[PDB]
PDB file with one MODEL, atoms N, CA, C and O in Angstrom:
MODEL        1
ATOM      1  N   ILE A   1       1.558   3.772  -3.087  1.00  0.00           N
ATOM      2  CA  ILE A   1       1.100   4.801  -4.009  1.00  0.00           C
ATOM      3  C   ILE A   1       0.658   6.040  -3.238  1.00  0.00           C
ATOM      4  O   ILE A   1      -0.111   5.943  -2.281  1.00  0.00           O
ATOM      5  N   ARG A   2       1.146   7.201  -3.657  1.00  0.00           N
ATOM      6  CA  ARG A   2       0.807   8.453  -3.014  1.00  0.00           C
ATOM      7  C   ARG A   2       1.250   9.633  -3.869  1.00  0.00           C
ATOM      8  O   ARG A   2       2.351   9.639  -4.420  1.00  0.00           O
ATOM      9  N   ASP A   3       0.379  10.626  -3.969  1.00  0.00           N
ATOM     10  CA  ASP A   3       0.650  11.838  -4.729  1.00  0.00           C
ATOM     11  C   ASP A   3      -0.168  12.977  -4.148  1.00  0.00           C
ATOM     12  O   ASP A   3      -1.374  12.840  -3.941  1.00  0.00           O
ATOM     13  N   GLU A   4       0.483  14.096  -3.887  1.00  0.00           N
ATOM     14  CA  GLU A   4      -0.197  15.243  -3.320  1.00  0.00           C
ATOM     15  C   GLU A   4      -0.792  16.121  -4.412  1.00  0.00           C
ATOM     16  O   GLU A   4      -0.442  17.294  -4.546  1.00  0.00           O
ATOM     17  N   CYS A   5      -1.693  15.536  -5.188  1.00  0.00           N
ATOM     18  CA  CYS A   5      -2.367  16.233  -6.269  1.00  0.00           C
ATOM     19  C   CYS A   5      -3.209  17.370  -5.681  1.00  0.00           C
ATOM     20  O   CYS A   5      -3.522  18.346  -6.364  1.00  0.00           O
ATOM     21  N   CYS A   6      -3.567  17.225  -4.408  1.00  0.00           N
ATOM     22  CA  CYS A   6      -4.357  18.226  -3.706  1.00  0.00           C
ATOM     23  C   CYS A   6      -3.583  19.539  -3.585  1.00  0.00           C
ATOM     24  O   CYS A   6      -4.074  20.599  -3.975  1.00  0.00           O
ATOM     25  N   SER A   7      -2.373  19.455  -3.043  1.00  0.00           N
ATOM     26  CA  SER A   7      -1.523  20.625  -2.868  1.00  0.00           C
ATOM     27  C   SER A   7      -0.841  21.012  -4.181  1.00  0.00           C
ATOM     28  O   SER A   7      -0.450  22.163  -4.376  1.00  0.00           O
ATOM     29  N   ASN A   8      -0.706  20.034  -5.075  1.00  0.00           N
ATOM     30  CA  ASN A   8      -0.062  20.232  -6.374  1.00  0.00           C
ATOM     31  C   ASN A   8      -0.680  21.411  -7.123  1.00  0.00           C
ATOM     32  O   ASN A   8      -1.876  21.399  -7.418  1.00  0.00           O
ATOM     33  N   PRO A   9       0.130  22.435  -7.435  1.00  0.00           N
ATOM     34  CA  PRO A   9      -0.340  23.623  -8.149  1.00  0.00           C
ATOM     35  C   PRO A   9      -0.904  23.287  -9.526  1.00  0.00           C
ATOM     36  O   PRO A   9      -1.970  23.773  -9.902  1.00  0.00           O
ATOM     37  N   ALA A  10      -0.185  22.456 -10.273  1.00  0.00           N
ATOM     38  CA  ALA A  10      -0.619  22.051 -11.603  1.00  0.00           C
ATOM     39  C   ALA A  10      -1.923  21.271 -11.519  1.00  0.00           C
ATOM     40  O   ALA A  10      -2.856  21.517 -12.283  1.00  0.00           O
ATOM     41  N   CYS A  11      -1.977  20.329 -10.584  1.00  0.00           N
ATOM     42  CA  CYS A  11      -3.171  19.519 -10.379  1.00  0.00           C
ATOM     43  C   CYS A  11      -4.347  20.410 -10.006  1.00  0.00           C
ATOM     44  O   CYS A  11      -5.456  20.237 -10.511  1.00  0.00           O
ATOM     45  N   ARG A  12      -4.096  21.364  -9.118  1.00  0.00           N
ATOM     46  CA  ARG A  12      -5.121  22.307  -8.676  1.00  0.00           C
ATOM     47  C   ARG A  12      -5.654  23.122  -9.854  1.00  0.00           C
ATOM     48  O   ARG A  12      -6.853  23.389  -9.937  1.00  0.00           O
ATOM     49  N   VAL A  13      -4.765  23.516 -10.760  1.00  0.00           N
ATOM     50  CA  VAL A  13      -5.164  24.297 -11.932  1.00  0.00           C
ATOM     51  C   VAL A  13      -5.976  23.442 -12.905  1.00  0.00           C
ATOM     52  O   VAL A  13      -6.973  23.900 -13.464  1.00  0.00           O
ATOM     53  N   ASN A  14      -5.543  22.204 -13.099  1.00  0.00           N
ATOM     54  CA  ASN A  14      -6.221  21.282 -14.003  1.00  0.00           C
ATOM     55  C   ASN A  14      -7.541  20.815 -13.413  1.00  0.00           C
ATOM     56  O   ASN A  14      -8.568  20.795 -14.092  1.00  0.00           O
ATOM     57  N   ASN A  15      -7.501  20.441 -12.142  1.00  0.00           N
ATOM     58  CA  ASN A  15      -8.685  19.959 -11.439  1.00  0.00           C
ATOM     59  C   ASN A  15      -8.998  20.837 -10.227  1.00  0.00           C
ATOM     60  O   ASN A  15      -8.541  20.543  -9.122  1.00  0.00           O
ATOM     61  N   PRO A  16      -9.774  21.916 -10.421  1.00  0.00           N
ATOM     62  CA  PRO A  16     -10.131  22.824  -9.334  1.00  0.00           C
ATOM     63  C   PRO A  16     -11.212  22.268  -8.415  1.00  0.00           C
ATOM     64  O   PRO A  16     -12.250  21.786  -8.869  1.00  0.00           O
ATOM     65  N   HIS A  17     -10.946  22.346  -7.115  1.00  0.00           N
ATOM     66  CA  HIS A  17     -11.868  21.889  -6.076  1.00  0.00           C
ATOM     67  C   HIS A  17     -12.239  20.422  -6.252  1.00  0.00           C
ATOM     68  O   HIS A  17     -13.320  19.991  -5.848  1.00  0.00           O
ATOM     69  N   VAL A  18     -11.342  19.668  -6.851  1.00  0.00           N
ATOM     70  CA  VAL A  18     -11.557  18.251  -7.026  1.00  0.00           C
ATOM     71  C   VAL A  18     -11.233  17.545  -5.713  1.00  0.00           C
ATOM     72  O   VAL A  18     -11.874  16.563  -5.339  1.00  0.00           O
ATOM     73  N   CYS A  19     -10.228  18.069  -5.030  1.00  0.00           N
ATOM     74  CA  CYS A  19      -9.813  17.534  -3.742  1.00  0.00           C
ATOM     75  C   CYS A  19     -10.584  18.216  -2.618  1.00  0.00           C
ATOM     76  O   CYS A  19     -10.375  17.901  -1.446  1.00  0.00           O
TER      77      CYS A  19
ENDMDL
END
């Protein structure tokens, strides 16, 4: 299991400074 939600633009927009 692995996902670059950190670098992910959508993830970053949805979850800011979460990573």
